[PDB]
């Protein structure tokens, strides 16, 4: 042995033919498959052939094959085959691994829709993702948007947040609407006919209808509000509103003679108008 120093009665391998004992012959190559890669399936003593390139020199592997067949336990002798043939498979062809199973095949076509011989599932050869016909004649990033936008839970949250920003939920029957701006504080729920405030959600009562006790102006149209409500903080100018927190093109639905039509605010901006910029700061305090 070169590596461990015996001299007893196989290793006819290219550029060399050094002696190697069979206990440490196995171990060198068993390591070189289970740890190193194919380029490293070399003589330990000389370190020679150069397996970067030459294909007919890869006749070397034919000769190895027999030696490893019996010496290597089949676990690692498998890996010799696996590594070696998978090596050339991944050398620039139109070779694909199937996107779902462990199979592969040389896909020589002018097409993207590709069904797998083995598991019979289809995928895009480019994005290697399961093929629905939505993809058909669409770029990969296009289809992959569709998926993402169209998937519920994204939709669920994209909505849920939309209602976070733009919603308004009748306090009585709890029905969720989408707030049309331009209107005033006193709302009418189109489902159950209730009346209420935009800020506090406390109710509104018509003339001679307020039930809550210690009401002073029961005679009038009114509703009861907390200190917190936009109602009360709308009466503060920008000036005062600002320091509490330290410590125009908004779309209103506007009535015309034959219906309602959305239009921007149009108001002079001292980039929001006086009123809208006040609504801005009020919201942040809650």
């Amino acid at each position: 042995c070169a590596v461990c120093g015996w001299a007893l009665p196989m290793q006819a391998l290219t550029s060399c033919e050094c002696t190697i004992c069979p206990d440490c012959f196995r171990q060198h190559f068993t390591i070189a498959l289970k740890e190193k890669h194919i380029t490293d399936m070399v003589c330990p003593a000389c370190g020679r052939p150069d397996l970067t390139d030459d294909t007919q020199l890869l006749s070397y592997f034919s000769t190895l094959d027999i030696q490893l067949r019996e010496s290597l336990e089949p676990d690692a002798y498998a890996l010799f085959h696996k590594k070696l043939t998978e090596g050339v498979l991944m050398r620039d062809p139109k070779f694909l691994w199937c996107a779902q199973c462990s199979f592969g095949f040389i896909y020589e076509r002018e097409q993207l829709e590709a069904t797998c011989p083995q598991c019979h599932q289809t995928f895009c050869v480019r994005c290697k993702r399961q093929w629905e016909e939505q993809h058909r004649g669409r770029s990969c990033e296009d289809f992959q948007n569709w998926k993402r936008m169209n998937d519920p839970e994204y939709q669920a949250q994209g909505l849920a947040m939309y209602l976070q920003e733009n919603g308004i939920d009748c306090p009585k029957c709890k029905f969720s609407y989408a707030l049309a701006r331009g209107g005033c504080m006193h709302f009418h729920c189109t489902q159950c006919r209730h009346q209420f405030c935009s800020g506090c959600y406390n109710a509104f009562y018509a003339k001679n209808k307020c039930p809550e006790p210690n009401c002073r102006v029961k005679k009038s149209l009114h509703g009861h509000h907390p200190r917190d409500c936009l109602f009360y903080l709308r009466d503060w100018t920008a000036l005062r509103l600002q320091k509490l927190l330290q410590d125009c093109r908004v779309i209103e639905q506007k009535e015309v003679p034959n219906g309602l039509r959305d239009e921007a605010c149009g108001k002079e901006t001292p980039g929001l108008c006086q009123a809208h910029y006040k609504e801005y700061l009020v919201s942040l305090i809650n």
Partner: protein, 76 residues
């Protein structure tokens, strides 16, 4: 092409549309089937507000997509 529209009530409807249909057209179909006036309708897809002058294809709305219907309210 068929698409779905679902309201907060949980009710889902099926519309027959083409990708070239404007959002206005889709609201008109919802009015036909549900009686809701277009002026009271807000439609959303993947969190995006769908605007009247645009088409289904502008928003990449494909076959079997689901739109969300939310009713509009103005204060009084």
């Amino acid at each position: 092409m068929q698409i779905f529209v679902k309201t907060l009530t949980g009710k889902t409807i099926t519309l027959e549309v083409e990708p070239s249909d404007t959002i206005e057209n889709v609201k008109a179909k919802i009015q036909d089937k549900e009686g809701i006036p277009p002026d009271q309708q807000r439609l959303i897809f993947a969190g995006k507000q769908l605007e009247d002058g645009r088409t289904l294809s502008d928003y990449n709305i494909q076959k079997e997509s689901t739109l969300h219907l939310v009713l509009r309210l103005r204060g009084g």
